Design a protein around this motif. Structure first.
Motif, PDB file in Angstrom:
ATOM      1  N   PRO A  69       0.821  -1.217   0.000  1.00  0.00           N
ATOM      2  CA  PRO A  69       0.000   0.000   0.000  1.00  0.00           C
ATOM      3  C   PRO A  69       0.850   1.260   0.000  1.00  0.00           C
ATOM      4  O   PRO A  69       1.808   1.389   0.764  1.00  0.00           O
ATOM      5  N   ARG A  70       0.493   2.191  -0.878  1.00  0.00           N
ATOM      6  CA  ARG A  70       1.307   3.378  -1.100  1.00  0.00           C
ATOM      7  C   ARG A  70       1.300   4.261   0.140  1.00  0.00           C
ATOM      8  O   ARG A  70       0.259   4.804   0.521  1.00  0.00           O
TER       9      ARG A  70
ATOM     10  N   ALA E  17     -18.442  -2.591  -0.956  1.00  0.00           N
ATOM     11  CA  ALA E  17     -17.197  -3.042  -0.352  1.00  0.00           C
ATOM     12  C   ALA E  17     -17.364  -3.459   1.101  1.00  0.00           C
ATOM     13  O   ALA E  17     -16.509  -4.179   1.624  1.00  0.00           O
ATOM     14  N   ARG E  24      -7.537  -5.812  -5.280  1.00  0.00           N
ATOM     15  CA  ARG E  24      -6.214  -5.490  -4.761  1.00  0.00           C
ATOM     16  C   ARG E  24      -5.701  -4.157  -5.289  1.00  0.00           C
ATOM     17  O   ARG E  24      -4.809  -3.554  -4.685  1.00  0.00           O
ATOM     18  N   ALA E  25      -6.231  -3.690  -6.420  1.00  0.00           N
ATOM     19  CA  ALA E  25      -5.767  -2.424  -6.979  1.00  0.00           C
ATOM     20  C   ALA E  25      -6.102  -1.257  -6.058  1.00  0.00           C
ATOM     21  O   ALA E  25      -5.222  -0.473  -5.687  1.00  0.00           O
ATOM     22  N   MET E  27      -6.992  -1.604  -3.046  1.00  0.00           N
ATOM     23  CA  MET E  27      -6.432  -1.965  -1.749  1.00  0.00           C
ATOM     24  C   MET E  27      -5.247  -1.081  -1.399  1.00  0.00           C
ATOM     25  O   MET E  27      -5.171  -0.517  -0.302  1.00  0.00           O
ATOM     26  N   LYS E  28      -4.315  -0.948  -2.332  1.00  0.00           N
ATOM     27  CA  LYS E  28      -2.995  -0.412  -2.053  1.00  0.00           C
ATOM     28  C   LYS E  28      -2.869   1.070  -2.372  1.00  0.00           C
ATOM     29  O   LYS E  28      -1.758   1.606  -2.320  1.00  0.00           O
ATOM     30  N   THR E  29      -3.965   1.743  -2.704  1.00  0.00           N
ATOM     31  CA  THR E  29      -3.930   3.175  -2.967  1.00  0.00           C
ATOM     32  C   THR E  29      -4.966   3.964  -2.185  1.00  0.00           C
ATOM     33  O   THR E  29      -4.720   5.125  -1.849  1.00  0.00           O
ATOM     34  N   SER E  30      -6.119   3.375  -1.886  1.00  0.00           N
ATOM     35  CA  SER E  30      -7.228   4.091  -1.271  1.00  0.00           C
ATOM     36  C   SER E  30      -7.367   3.727   0.202  1.00  0.00           C
ATOM     37  O   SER E  30      -7.237   2.560   0.581  1.00  0.00           O
ATOM     38  N   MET E  31      -7.634   4.742   1.027  1.00  0.00           N
ATOM     39  CA  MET E  31      -7.862   4.516   2.452  1.00  0.00           C
ATOM     40  C   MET E  31      -9.056   3.603   2.696  1.00  0.00           C
ATOM     41  O   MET E  31      -8.944   2.592   3.400  1.00  0.00           O
ATOM     42  N   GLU E  32     -10.208   3.943   2.119  1.00  0.00           N
ATOM     43  CA  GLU E  32     -11.439   3.237   2.458  1.00  0.00           C
ATOM     44  C   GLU E  32     -11.369   1.772   2.055  1.00  0.00           C
ATOM     45  O   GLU E  32     -11.862   0.899   2.777  1.00  0.00           O
ATOM     46  N   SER E  33     -10.767   1.481   0.901  1.00  0.00           N
ATOM     47  CA  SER E  33     -10.666   0.096   0.460  1.00  0.00           C
ATOM     48  C   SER E  33      -9.819  -0.731   1.419  1.00  0.00           C
ATOM     49  O   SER E  33     -10.185  -1.860   1.763  1.00  0.00           O
ATOM     50  N   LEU E  34      -8.684  -0.186   1.864  1.00  0.00           N
ATOM     51  CA  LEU E  34      -7.838  -0.932   2.790  1.00  0.00           C
ATOM     52  C   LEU E  34      -8.543  -1.141   4.122  1.00  0.00           C
ATOM     53  O   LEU E  34      -8.506  -2.242   4.683  1.00  0.00           O
ATOM     54  N   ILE E  35      -9.198  -0.099   4.636  1.00  0.00           N
ATOM     55  CA  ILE E  35      -9.921  -0.223   5.898  1.00  0.00           C
ATOM     56  C   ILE E  35     -10.975  -1.314   5.790  1.00  0.00           C
ATOM     57  O   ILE E  35     -11.114  -2.162   6.680  1.00  0.00           O
ATOM     58  N   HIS E  36     -11.722  -1.316   4.688  1.00  0.00           N
ATOM     59  CA  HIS E  36     -12.763  -2.317   4.492  1.00  0.00           C
ATOM     60  C   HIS E  36     -12.163  -3.708   4.348  1.00  0.00           C
ATOM     61  O   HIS E  36     -12.678  -4.680   4.908  1.00  0.00           O
ATOM     62  N   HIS E  37     -11.065  -3.822   3.599  1.00  0.00           N
ATOM     63  CA  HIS E  37     -10.411  -5.117   3.457  1.00  0.00           C
ATOM     64  C   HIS E  37      -9.881  -5.620   4.789  1.00  0.00           C
ATOM     65  O   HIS E  37      -9.945  -6.818   5.085  1.00  0.00           O
ATOM     66  N   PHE E  38      -9.340  -4.714   5.604  1.00  0.00           N
ATOM     67  CA  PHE E  38      -8.852  -5.107   6.919  1.00  0.00           C
ATOM     68  C   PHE E  38      -9.979  -5.681   7.766  1.00  0.00           C
ATOM     69  O   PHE E  38      -9.889  -6.807   8.266  1.00  0.00           O
TER      70      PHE E  38
ATOM     71  N   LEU F  25      -3.512 -10.711   9.598  1.00  0.00           N
ATOM     72  CA  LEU F  25      -4.746 -10.872   8.837  1.00  0.00           C
ATOM     73  C   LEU F  25      -4.950 -12.323   8.432  1.00  0.00           C
ATOM     74  O   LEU F  25      -6.055 -12.860   8.557  1.00  0.00           O
TER      75      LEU F  25
ATOM     76  N   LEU H  93     -10.590  10.387   6.414  1.00  0.00           N
ATOM     77  CA  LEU H  93      -9.821   9.324   5.785  1.00  0.00           C
ATOM     78  C   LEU H  93      -9.022   9.800   4.583  1.00  0.00           C
ATOM     79  O   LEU H  93      -8.318   8.989   3.971  1.00  0.00           O
ATOM     80  N   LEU H  98      -1.805   4.744   4.618  1.00  0.00           N
ATOM     81  CA  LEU H  98      -2.139   3.337   4.435  1.00  0.00           C
ATOM     82  C   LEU H  98      -1.273   2.481   5.347  1.00  0.00           C
ATOM     83  O   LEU H  98      -0.430   1.716   4.873  1.00  0.00           O
ATOM     84  N   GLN H 112     -11.641   2.774  11.881  1.00  0.00           N
ATOM     85  CA  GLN H 112     -12.081   1.614  11.108  1.00  0.00           C
ATOM     86  C   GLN H 112     -13.544   1.293  11.370  1.00  0.00           C
ATOM     87  O   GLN H 112     -14.340   1.160  10.433  1.00  0.00           O
ATOM     88  N   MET H 116     -16.626   1.476   8.917  1.00  0.00           N
ATOM     89  CA  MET H 116     -17.440   0.310   8.613  1.00  0.00           C
ATOM     90  C   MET H 116     -18.906   0.518   8.966  1.00  0.00           C
ATOM     91  O   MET H 116     -19.753  -0.255   8.507  1.00  0.00           O
ATOM     92  N   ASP H 121     -17.776   3.246   1.073  1.00  0.00           N
ATOM     93  CA  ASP H 121     -17.045   2.010   0.832  1.00  0.00           C
ATOM     94  C   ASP H 121     -15.971   2.187  -0.234  1.00  0.00           C
ATOM     95  O   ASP H 121     -15.415   1.200  -0.722  1.00  0.00           O
ATOM     96  N   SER H 123     -12.954   5.374  -1.949  1.00  0.00           N
ATOM     97  CA  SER H 123     -12.289   6.661  -1.808  1.00  0.00           C
ATOM     98  C   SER H 123     -12.270   7.377  -3.149  1.00  0.00           C
ATOM     99  O   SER H 123     -11.860   6.801  -4.161  1.00  0.00           O
ATOM    100  N   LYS H 129      -1.338  12.253  -0.496  1.00  0.00           N
ATOM    101  CA  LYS H 129      -1.587  12.432   0.926  1.00  0.00           C
ATOM    102  C   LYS H 129      -0.421  13.151   1.596  1.00  0.00           C
ATOM    103  O   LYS H 129       0.722  13.091   1.140  1.00  0.00           O
TER     104      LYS H 129
END
Ligand SMILES: CCCCCCCCCCC[C@H](O)CC(=O)SCCNC(=O)CCNC(=O)[C@H](O)C(C)(C)COP(=O)(O)O
Ligand code: SF4
Ligand code: SF4
Ligand code: SF4
Ligand code: SF4
Ligand code: FES
Ligand SMILES: [K+]
Ligand SMILES: [Zn+2]
Lengths: 96, 115, 209, 48, 60, 119, 129, 699, 87
Positions: A69-70, E17, E24-25, E27-38, F25, H93, H98, H112, H116, H121, H123, H129
């Protein structure tokens, strides 16, 4: 890297090593204590530090989606090179 | 309230009755299983085990409860006389491999932190 | 429908089943205690325990109901509720392609009349429920364990029963037979407290007790 | 692989190994963690 | 034969989501996607209270 | 197929540093609870795991773990063949996982390269 | 209400005779009935609205082969949620477990006023927001 | 009367005027999302998440800082409210890094859960950032400042609950760096509580440092024993080890705060520990041995000596069950020499009247007192939570704190009467100006510390302070229920020992040098081998071998305060039970299970055999140490007064100086604290400069 | 010698039955301490506990005597009897 215990065992990256008595050592005899030589701790130190000139630097870890993650490392503290918490690559400002 | 629906028995007495023909059936049942199941215990060594469960199950007073395990005993007896169980199943009553567990406090103290 | 994610709603079925809910309630007010239709069009018929036989015969025989297929027969053990076990029947109506759910409550001791007569499918479901939970079913053809091992003690699906159980098995050579030992895990079950401390659904908020 | 060589990196092995079960090169599991609870080493000076 | 001939274009999971994990795309750039995936792979989606019986024509 | 599920492996970055930052995880999603990991602040300061025992006799190759970690740390290799003669050999620790990562790294890089777009 | 020969049983319910709990785990084990504490690092209070019954902790020894958390008490990872306290305890005697009851700790009602942050004489004037 | 009728989601609620909107919806269960409003802290409204839809209103309102009045329906679930909730949370957020795969707060992560629940859901951020440099403010609190979002929580806690005005915000705009500007070192007795008030994973426990993650750990509730306040704590354990100690909620006991001494001391449990019984060999070196011979050697020669030649000095962290077991065992040989490390004046009432040796007014009572008189103590480092309550009441109720003794700082302005003990009798007579102030005060209060009584003139000061309390008690300014006299204790298990009947102090052992000394948890090192005669059988129980074990013949290992089900009583007589979290290490057993097992082999077998039995006996000796979590409000202050003026002693000239004077001596108090490494690091952090302490972690 | 190793009373703060002993300690207690300074008269109290007196003699010796609804002088004689046999 991988050193040798006084008994003869090989210390791993975590530093685990069955001591002198350590009845558990019987398993390794007639076998081997599996140890990975490519120690992650010293396999990242020799990587050079990037001399990029900015204040905030992203780190994808290489490969984009293939990386991590970036995260944006702040290269402002001029004492210690900023490192990404995911891969350990050290980034630093080019000393003005 | 206090009024509850009884299973089969209508007070202690016939509840005390039902445990009898279970013992009546169990007692008649011991010697043939020792022969049929090829057990290692003696015929005498089966009656006590049949017996000792019964006043092991002696603090029970509720008539509904009493009738509930007399069915379980009947079912256990049922699943025994058709050789549905096996030598291992019957032998599980005899706690054989399990080493004796201490009882005195001092031995409890020596082995480990447990009541 | 602009919304592409939300499941579509069928109000016609919702009204249709709700009317039938008033129907069954009026015909048998002696046993039916509550009737409700969920948001996803499922009708629950809350009956009293003694109504297990009468109510079931009505939905199986009445011309306007014709529920002639026992889908399943389960219980959900709720340690909280005074009578913990809650016996649940599911019936499917071939003629009217609808499904109904009659639910009744029962404690550990009180028995429920076996529905073998009205639904011969219930016979084997009858045995499972007693075996897993301990709900004894009255006047049953043959109540016996169907799932647990022979001589297995306790009722596993009961909540108070531990996940791993009490008795293990292994082969012991001094006896040359499989023997039972107290349970001794090489690894305890790592229980996870994976519950959010924030309310999830304002719609289903319990009253402020 | 001759037409498309896999991307080579430092840590990739240079000698493939068969499954070493049976032979004395077999892998034996062992805890990789350090000790949690040590003990208070008694002193060397005598009682008095 | 009909399923192959009438396959429609589109995604393969619900766009929500909070129910289905993001790709996964993002996942690694957006805050909300990572939070939801977590939370989705640690806690999982919390379904509303209720009971249902869904049956399908399985081959058996 | 490139997305085949088999023997696990713990890969590492192109630099050589391991991908696993020990976010737990995979342990939190493991259906068989086979994952057992503990972390620690390493000497360099990075966040790695002291222990990563995967019990290959418990987990059922759901593949959730490869979907779990956001750094592609754990992933089942294409090697369907790792049958052993003793039960203990199947209980993998962190060291064996890294060794599998160092052995099948050519396949995992290629297979993931093919299927990283479908996911 | 049923006309089914309603016997007036009075003895307190005890199904420990049937649940099959072994002799060690029925008397010695002591259960605790309590409302879970609000996780202090969080702020939501959803997890503190249901009484829970849990059993005492027992020995946790490390497995010889690989460092594990092996135990031998089946009643270790078994918690049970309960709506109200009397209903929770009613389970304890019914299953014959020596229980210990706490009381529902609830936040006492506070009085918050944004005007207090800037007072004329009262020493509650916030130094910075 | 006064109650104002307002509506929430249609339903009508009855609220006291001045109630905020957030409180009103809480009365029905609706918990408005929040990030800035903390109940124990002030209100700031910086959160902007508590925005809620007011019925027939055009403007969304901040539920936190808004006094609700009549004729308002709080439309919590309205579309306007949800849009505002969605809008501000997306803003929150936007600049979060990240990190939460590696951020320790992942699992709690107040961002989180709210995301949730109340948040989108996906961004829509398409820019870069912001990144914020980390600032070091402790070897015990980590600071990944790039994660946290406009705290006002760290800031208020430092400026209200801890008094340390070092945390703040620097700048404006998106950055407005929050921290300390100059390189400072945030140390306070309550500094560690910034960790659990951080919604974001920036301020994180440095000793924790990704040891485990929330879901996998099991939470058990117990009581801390490091201090005498008795803070309720949650011992989060997994796999048989303790990673974190969290503060529980008890309002009057500890609110939701615990001292750093109580928080980052679990690592002491993993430091120097006793595992197996050890006995002296031929040469004089302790050697491991089985339980039988260690007990047999103790039992064998306990049988020989009898009378008043068999003593026992209980330590600091002792179990009430252990105390009563030792008391009964050591009284079947007729030895009423049961002593303890802390000394309390036996002249007069002594241990007879409960009113003497406890905080009579209860901790919560200090939140309604008018004036207070701290005498010869440093409550900041003696009982940190008790000092917080003084500050809280000082902050809100405007209490007038007065301090007679050392000028030690107490995070608030205190009137320094001086340090000479002569001031006490001046106040008692009435010539001193402070005497009449206590007369006018409607709830006046005086408190003494066990540190002050530890002096040679403990009887002199206690009698003098008791004379002071009555001198203002005669005036009806005090209420019919107000308990003026109070004694603040430091050692946790000293009230229980004094309640049980253990002789306070150690002077009894010196007057009669025993032949067998039962050092049970003692680690103060007051009785060395020189005091007792030659060839003493010093038997040392306990968990951490610090000073008792080096001077001993038998090293019977005991459990720790997290490895048993003991009963610890606080400084106000509130017997609290501590549940077992992790089993005792090695071969060590419980404490009462030592004495009971020892009595059986020796011959004078104790009656009780199970835990419920010993508590029942513990009930027999005293009826309050079984009643849990209830201050059994004692009485009888006055008879202990005329019983006290008998001896009259005489005050010395040494100024009242508490042993704890600077943060440096705070951490090094007990065996658990001394053993731990994190405590040593904090001591290092405060001794030398503000830069020689840091834990490498890129969390 | 089993003489009065310690004396323990357990009264309730508010129970009407405990009223008698409360009056006793209110008036006839300071004299008792002055009479036997060595002998510790523990007054461990609680709520809803019936008024109760405990005596501790020599090796593991304890005797019990209830003080339910005992009058003021009634309990003074009761203690006077207990400490009469200082052996
Ligand atoms: C090889 C293996 C073979 C198979 C091995 C044995 C297999 C299992 C056999 C059945 C065991 C089952 O748990 C118990 C049952 O069936 S029934 C219990 C009867 N419980 C009562 O009746 C009430 C309580 N008890 C009393 O009322 C009286 O104390 C008593 C009846 C004891 C004596 O009566 P007395 O008039 O006092
Ligand atoms: S493959 Fe699935 S079951 Fe196996 S360890 Fe990974 S997550 Fe667990
Ligand atoms: S393997 Fe993946 S899921 Fe498991 S700890 Fe490492 S990064 Fe997280
Ligand atoms: S605060 Fe930490 S855990 Fe929460 S979202 Fe941000 S990085 Fe993730
Ligand atoms: S650490 Fe927490 S309280 Fe402090 S600024 Fe960051 S989010 Fe706010
Ligand atoms: S709660 Fe944060 S603004 Fe009111
Ligand atoms: K935090
Ligand atoms: Zn990186």
């Amino acid at each position: 890297g991988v050193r040798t215990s006084p008994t003869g065992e090989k210390v791993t990256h975590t530093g685990q090593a069955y001591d002198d008595g350590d009845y558990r050592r019987v398993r390794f005899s007639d076998r081997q204590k599996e140890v990975n030589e490519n120690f992650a701790i010293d396999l990242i130190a020799e990587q050079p530090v990037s001399e990029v000139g900015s204040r905030v630097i992203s780190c994808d870890g290489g490969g984009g989606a293939l990386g991590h993650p970036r995260v944006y490392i702040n290269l402002d503290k001029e004492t210690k090179t900023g490192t990404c918490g995911y891969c350990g690559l050290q980034f630093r400002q080019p000393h003005h | 309230g206090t009024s509850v629906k009884p299973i089969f028995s209508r007070d202690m007495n016939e509840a005390k009755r039902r445990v009898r023909e279970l013992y009546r059936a169990w007692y008649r049942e011991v010697p043939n299983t020792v022969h049929l199941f090829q057990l290692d215990i003696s015929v005498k060594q089966g009656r006590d085990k049949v017996r000792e469960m019964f006043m092991k199950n002696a603090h029970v007073t509720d008539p509904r409860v009493v009738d509930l395990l007399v069915i379980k005993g009947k079912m256990e007896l049922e699943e025994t006389i058709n050789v549905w169980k096996q030598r291992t199943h019957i032998m599980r009553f005899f706690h054989e491999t399990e080493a004796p567990r201490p009882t005195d406090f001092l031995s409890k103290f020596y082995v480990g932190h447990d009541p | 429908d602009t919304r592409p994610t939300i499941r579509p709603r069928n109000d016609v079925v919702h009204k249709q089943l709700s009317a039938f809910g008033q129907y069954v309630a009026e015909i048998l007010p002696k046993y039916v205690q509550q009737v409700q239709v969920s948001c996803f069009n499922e009708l629950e018929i809350f009956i009293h325990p003694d109504g297990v036989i009468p109510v079931l015969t009505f939905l199986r025989d009445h011309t306007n109901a014709q529920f002639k297929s026992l889908a399943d027969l389960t219980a959900v053990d709720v340690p909280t509720r005074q009578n913990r076990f809650e016996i649940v029947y599911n019936l499917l109506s071939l003629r009217f392609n609808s499904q109904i759910r009659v639910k009744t409550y029962t404690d550990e001791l009180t028995p429920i009349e076996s529905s073998v007569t009205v639904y011969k499918a219930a016979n084997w479901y009858e045995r499972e429920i007693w075996d897993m939970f301990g709900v004894f079913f009255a006047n049953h053809p043959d109540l016996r364990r169907i799932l647990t091992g022979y001589g297995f003690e306790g009722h596993p699906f009961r909540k108070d029963f531990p996940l791993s159980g009490y008795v293990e098995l292994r082969y012991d050579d001094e006896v040359k037979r499989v023997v039972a030992e107290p349970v001794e895990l090489a690894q305890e079950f790592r229980k996870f407290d994976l519950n959010s401390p924030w309310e999830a659904f304002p719609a289903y908020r319990q009253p402020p007790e | 692989p001759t037409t498309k060589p896999p991307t080579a990196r430092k840590y990739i092995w240079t000698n493939h190994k068969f499954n070493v079960s049976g032979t004395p090169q077999q892998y034996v599991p062992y805890s990789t963690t350090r000790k949690k609870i040590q003990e208070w080493v008694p002193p060397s000076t005598p009682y008095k | 034969s009909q399923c192959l001939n009438k396959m429609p274009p589109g995604e393969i999971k619900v766009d929500d989501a909070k129910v289905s994990p993001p790709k996964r795309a993002e996942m690694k750039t957006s805050m909300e996607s990572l939070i939801h995936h977590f939370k989705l792979y640690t806690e999982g989606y919390q379904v509303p209270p209720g009971a249902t019986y869904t049956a399908i024509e399985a081959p058996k | 197929s490139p997305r085949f599920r088999g023997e696990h492996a713990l890969r590492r970055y192109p630099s050589g540093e391991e991908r696993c930052i020990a976010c737990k995880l995979c342990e939190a999603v493991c259906p068989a609870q086979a994952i057992t990991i503990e972390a620690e602040p390493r000497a360099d300061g990075s966040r790695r795991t002291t222990r990563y025992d995967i019990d290959m006799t418990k987990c059922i190759y759901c593949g959730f773990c490869q979907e779990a970690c956001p750094v592609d740390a754990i992933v089942e290799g294409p090697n369907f063949e790792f049958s052993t003669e003793t039960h203990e050999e199947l209980l993998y620790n962190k060291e064996k996982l890294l060794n599998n990562g160092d052995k099948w790294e050519a396949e995992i890089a290629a297979n993931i390269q093919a299927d990283y777009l479908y996911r | 209400t049923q006309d089914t020969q309603l016997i007036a049983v009075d003895e307190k319910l005890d199904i420990t005779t049937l649940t099959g709990v072994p002799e060690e785990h029925i008397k010695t084990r002591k259960v605790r009935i309590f409302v879970p504490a609000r996780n202090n690092m969080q702020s939501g209070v959803n997890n503190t609205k249901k009484w829970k019954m849990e059993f005492d902790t027992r020995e946790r020894w490390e497995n010889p082969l690989m460092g594990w958390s092996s135990t031998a008490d089946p009643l270790s990872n078994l918690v049970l949620t309960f709506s109200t306290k009397e209903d929770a305890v009613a389970f304890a005697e019914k299953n014959g477990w020596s229980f210990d009851v706490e009381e529902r700790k609830v936040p006492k009602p506070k009085s918050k006023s944004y005007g207090a942050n800037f007072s004329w004489n009262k020493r509650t004037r916030v130094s910075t927001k | 009367s006064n109650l104002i009728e307002v509506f929430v989601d249609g339903q009508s609620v009855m609220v006291e005027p001045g109630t905020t909107v957030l409180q009103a919806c809480e009365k029905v269960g609706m918990q408005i999302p929040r990030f800035c409003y903390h109940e124990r802290l002030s209100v700031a409204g910086n959160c902007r998440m508590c925005l809620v839809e007011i019925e027939k209103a055009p403007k969304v309102v901040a539920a936190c800082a808004m006094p609700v009045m009549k004729g308002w329906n709080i439309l919590t679930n309205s579309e306007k409210s949800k849009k505002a909730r969605e809008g501000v949370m997306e803003f929150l957020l936007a600049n979060h890094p990240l990190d939460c795969p590696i951020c320790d707060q992942g699992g709690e992560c107040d961002l989180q859960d709210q995301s949730m629940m109340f948040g989108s859901d996906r961004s829509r951020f398409l820019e870069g950032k912001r990144a914020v440099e980390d600032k070091n403010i402790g070897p015990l609190v980590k600071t990944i400042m790039t994660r946290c979002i406009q705290c006002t929580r760290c800031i208020r806690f430092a400026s209200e609950i801890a008094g340390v005005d070092d945390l703040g915000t620097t700048g404006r705009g998106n950055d407005m760096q929050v921290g300390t500007y100059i390189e400072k070192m945030f140390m306070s007795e309550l500094s560690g509580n910034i960790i659990d008030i951080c919604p974001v994973g920036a301020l994180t426990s440095k000793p924790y440092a990704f040891t485990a993650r929330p879901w996998e750990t099991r939470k058990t509730e117990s009581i801390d024993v490091m201090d005498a306040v008795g803070s309720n704590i949650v011992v989060s354990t997994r796999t048989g080890e303790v990673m974190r100690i969290l503060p529980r909620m008890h309002e009057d006991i500890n609110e939701e705060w615990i001292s750093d001494k109580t928080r980052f001391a679990y690592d002491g449990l993993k430091r120097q520990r006793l595992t197996q019984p050890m006995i002296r060999n031929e040469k004089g070196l302790l050697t491991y041995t089985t339980w039988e011979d260690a007990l047999s050697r103790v039992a064998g020669m306990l049988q020989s000596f009898q009378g008043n030649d068999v003593a026992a000095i209980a330590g600091g962290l002792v179990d009430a069950e252990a105390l009563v077991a030792l008391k009964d065992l050591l009284n079947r040989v007729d030895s009423d020499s049961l002593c303890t490390e802390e000394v309390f004046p036996t002249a007069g009432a002594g241990t007879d009247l409960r009113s003497n040796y406890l905080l009579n007014t209860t901790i919560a009572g200090v939140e309604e007192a008018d004036v207070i008189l701290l005498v010869g103590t440093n409550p900041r480092f003696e009982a940190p939570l008790f000092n917080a309550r003084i500050r809280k009441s000082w902050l809100h109720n405007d209490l007038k704190v007065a301090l007679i003794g050392s000028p030690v700082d107490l995070t608030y302005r205190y009137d320094h009467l001086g340090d000479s003990p002569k001031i006490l009798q001046d106040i008692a007579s009435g010539n001193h100006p402070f005497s009449q102030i206590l007369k006018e005060a409607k709830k006046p209060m005086v408190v003494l510390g066990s540190s002050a009584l530890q002096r040679s003139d403990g009887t002199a000061i206690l009698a003098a302070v008791s004379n002071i309390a009555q001198n203002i008690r005669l005036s009806s300014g005090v209420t019919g229920d107000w308990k003026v006299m109070n004694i603040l204790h430091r050692i946790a298990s000293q009230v229980a020992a004094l309640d049980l009947g253990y002789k306070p102090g150690v002077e009894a052992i010196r007057k009669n040098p025993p032949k067998v000394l039962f050092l049970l948890g003692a680690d103060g090192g007051c009785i060395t081998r020189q005091d007792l005669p030659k060839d003493c059988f010093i038997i040392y129980q306990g968990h951490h071998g610090d000073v008792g074990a080096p001077m001993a013949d038998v090293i019977l290992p005991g459990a720790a305060y997290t490895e048993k089900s003991a009963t610890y009583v606080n400084t106000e007589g509130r017997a609290q039970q501590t549940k077992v979290a992790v089993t005792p290490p090695g071969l060590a057993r419980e404490d009462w299970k030592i004495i009971r097992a020892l009595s059986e082999i020796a011959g004078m077998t104790l009656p009780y055999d199970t835990l419920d039995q010993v508590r029942s006996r513990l009930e027999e000796v005293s009826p309050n140490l079984v009643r849990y979590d209830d201050v059994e409000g004692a009485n009888y202050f006055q008879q202990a007064n005329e019983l006290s003026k008998l001896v009259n002693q005489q005050l010395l000239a040494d100024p009242l100086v508490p042993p704890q004077l600077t943060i440096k001596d705070f951490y090094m108090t007990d065996s658990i604290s001394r053993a731990s490494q994190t405590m040593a690091k904090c001591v290092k952090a405060v001794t030398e400069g503000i830069q020689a302490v840091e834990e490498p972690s890129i969390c | 010698k089993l003489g009065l190793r310690e004396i323990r009373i357990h009264l309730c703060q508010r129970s009407p039955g405990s009223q008698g002993v409360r009056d006793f300690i209110e008036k006839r207690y300071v004299e008792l301490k002055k009479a036997n300074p060595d002998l510790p008269i523990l007054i461990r109290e609680c709520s809803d506990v019936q008024p109760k007196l405990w005596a501790r003699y020599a090796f593991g010796q304890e005797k019990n005597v209830s003080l339910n609804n005992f009058s003021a002088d009634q309990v003074t004689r009761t203690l006077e009897n207990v400490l009469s046999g200082k052996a």
